[PDB]
């Protein structure tokens, strides 16, 4: 019954050492000038987070290449099998079905 | 004797000697003496590093540092020999686990009312508080009145100062509030009867001294510092949470620098607005500062931009 006590040790040792660094030896009530400083090594950034198109298409493209490796995942389990002409010719289909989805998108990527 | 402009790097005659001068009250004095320029001999107790932010105030050879325990005689008889004035502000809050706290306001202002007095100084100055009364309060608030009385025997003319309660920049008085992000906001003691006192602004108390340090003719004439406009309410604690929108200690932490489950919860609510015949601030001119202008600055929590300030108080009554 240790799997599950193989990790709750590892996380309670993890959260131990962070509160004996963030808490305990810390408490900065003295001068501790938390004024307007601490702005990540800069000043006031009156602009918000702007949209960037070339950094959105990288999210979606990965997601559609990520799905059909899970279809491709039980290939070693598809070895010790029955009829295997089917098993070979269907396994080669998905990879080409992944490969064409490159070549259409490959004619327009952009500065990724 | 003086020379030239008093901007920096002048002479200005005076040679002070400011004891303490590490805390919120003692430091901000020396800043205005590191401008007009003078031999401000500052001795310190046990702090080599904690006094380092004091050095770009004295120009070059203006200030000078010495170590001194306080109870021993000659360690405070070696710096007081070449001086013109000497002001005192030594002391603390709660009794420590090494000292005795009783004669520390009696013998120790007398230990520097020793041959210090004899050697030829003038304009020796001590401090008071607007609430230190010999009636039965408190262990700190009275036994400061011992220092008002038992040290007055020596130096029969001082101009001991009696400032009001102070709000400032790095202080503890107002900062004891709004640091109560806690399991509840408990006022003292769920009542708004005598709140509030006179929160004088710390630039005025350090401007009263430097107008008294060459006044002249202010010896023995003790002074009491007027506060802001005008009294205040319990609305103060609501006003603190209005805009806020809800040294040399140790290496890791000092396990005892507490919020003092003792007299300290009532060491500030005993108000005693004292005699208005004391002269005491405006005649030590010229300074009169409110609270609602300098209230944005020192109150500072996690909004940090959006204030939208409109919170105020009428006077309050008995104004
Ligand atoms: N007028 C007011 O409204 C008011 C309000 C609160 C307190 N006070 C008292 O008036 C003075 C204002 O001081 P402050 O506001 O700057 O706070 P503070 O923390 O008391 O600073 C005064 C200095 O005295 C030092 N000190 C304590 N015991 C000492 C001892 N035996 N020998 C030598 N130094 C000692 C302290 O630590 P170090 O020894 O490390 O230097 C501190 O640096 C103090 O005496 C204070 O108790 C006045």
UniProtKB/Swiss-Prot annotation, chain A:
It comes from the Eukaryota. Signal peptide: none annotated. It is an enzyme of class 7 (translocase). GO terms for cellular component: mitochondrial inner membrane; respiratory chain complex I. Its EC number is 7.1.1.2. It catalyses: a ubiquinone + NADH + 5 H(+)(in) = a ubiquinol + NAD(+) + 4 H(+)(out). GO terms for molecular function: NADH dehydrogenase (ubiquinone) activity. Keywords: Electron transport, Formylation, Membrane, Mitochondrion, Mitochondrion inner membrane, NAD, Respiratory chain, Translocase, Transmembrane, Transmembrane helix, Transport, Ubiquinone. One of its GO terms (biological process) is mitochondrial electron transport, NADH to ubiquinone. The chain crosses the membrane at residues 3-23, 55-75, 84-104. It is found in: Mitochondrion inner membrane. The keyword Transmembrane applies. It is a multi-pass membrane protein. The modification N-formylmethionine is found at residue 1. Belongs to the complex I subunit 3 family. Core subunit of respiratory chain NADH dehydrogenase (Complex I) which is composed of 45 different subunits. Interacts with TMEM186. Interacts with TMEM242. Core subunit of the mitochondrial membrane respiratory chain NADH dehydrogenase (Complex I) which catalyzes electron transfer from NADH through the respiratory chain, using ubiquinone as an electron acceptor. Essential for the catalytic activity of complex I. This is NADH-ubiquinone oxidoreductase chain 3.
Swiss-Prot record, chain B:
The modification N6-acetyllysine is found at residue 149. GO terms for cellular component: mitochondrial inner membrane; mitochondrial matrix; mitochondrion; respiratory chain complex I. One of its GO terms (biological process) is circadian rhythm. One of its GO terms (molecular function) is protein-containing complex binding. It is found in: Mitochondrion matrix. Transmembrane segments: none annotated. Its cofactor is FAD. Binds 1 FAD per subunit. It comes from the Eukaryota. Keywords: Acetylation, Electron transport, FAD, Flavoprotein, Mitochondrion, Respiratory chain, Transit peptide, Transport. Acetylated on lysine residues. BLOC1S1 is required for acetylation. Belongs to the complex I NDUFA9 subunit family. Accessory subunit of the mitochondrial membrane respiratory chain NADH dehydrogenase (Complex I), that is believed not to be involved in catalysis. Complex I functions in the transfer of electrons from NADH to the respiratory chain. The immediate electron acceptor for the enzyme is believed to be ubiquinone. This is NADH dehydrogenase [ubiquinone] 1 alpha subcomplex subunit 9, mitochondrial. It comes from Bos taurus. The gene is NDUFA9.
């Amino acid at each position: 019954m240790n799997l599950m006590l193989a990790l709750l040790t590892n996380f309670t040792l993890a959260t131990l050492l962070v509160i004996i660094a963030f808490w305990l030896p810390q408490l900065n009530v003295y001068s501790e000038k938390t004024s307007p400083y601490e702005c990540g090594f800069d000043p006031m950034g009156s602009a918000r987070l702007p949209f960037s198109m070339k950094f959105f298409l990288v999210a979606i493209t990965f997601l559609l290449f990520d799905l059909e490796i899970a279809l491709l995942l039980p290939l070693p389990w598809a070895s010790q099998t029955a009829n295997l002409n089917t098993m070979l010719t269907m396994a080669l289909f998905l990879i080409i079905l992944l490969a064409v989805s490159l070549a259409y998108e490959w004619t327009q990527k952009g500065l990724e | 004797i003086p020379h030239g402009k008093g901007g920096r790097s002048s002479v200005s005659g005076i040679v002070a000697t400011v004891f303490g001068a590490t805390g919120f009250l003692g430091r901000y004095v020396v800043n205005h003496l590191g401008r007009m320029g003078s031999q401000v001999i500052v001795p310190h107790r046990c702090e080599p590093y904690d006094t380092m932010h004091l050095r770009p105030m004295g120009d070059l050879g203006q200030i000078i540092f010495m170590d001194w325990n306080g109870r021993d005689k000659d360690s405070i008889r070696r710096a007081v020999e070449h001086s013109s004035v000497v002001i005192n502000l030594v002391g603390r809050e709660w009794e420590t686990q090494n000292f005795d706290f009783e004669d520390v306001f009696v013998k120790i202002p007398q230990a520097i009312a020793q041959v210090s007095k004899e050697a030829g100084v003038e304009k020796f100055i001590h401090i008071s508080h607007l609430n230190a009364d010999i009636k039965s309060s408190s262990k700190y608030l009275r036994s400061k009145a011992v220092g008002e009385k038992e040290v007055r025997e020596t130096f029969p003319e001082a101009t001991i100062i009696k400032p009001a309660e102070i709000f400032g920049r790095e202080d503890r008085f107002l900062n004891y509030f709004a640091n109560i992000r806690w399991f509840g906001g408990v006022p003292l003691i769920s009542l708004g009867k005598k709140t509030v006192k006179q929160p004088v602004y710390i630039v005025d108390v350090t401007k009263g001294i430097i107008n008294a340090i060459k006044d002249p003719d202010a010896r023995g004439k003790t002074f009491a510092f007027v506060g802001p406009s005008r009294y205040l309410l319990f609305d103060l604690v609501q006003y603190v949470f209005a805009v806020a929108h809800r040294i040399g200690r140790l290496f890791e932490i000092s396990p005892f620098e507490p919020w003092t489950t003792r007299d300290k919860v009532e060491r500030i609510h005993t108000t005693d607005k004292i005699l208005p015949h004391l002269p005491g601030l405006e005649d030590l001119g010229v300074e009169a500062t409110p609270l609602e202008l300098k209230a944005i600055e020192v109150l500072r929590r996690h909004r940090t931009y959006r204030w939208l300030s409109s919170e105020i108080e009428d006077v309050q009554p008995a104004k």
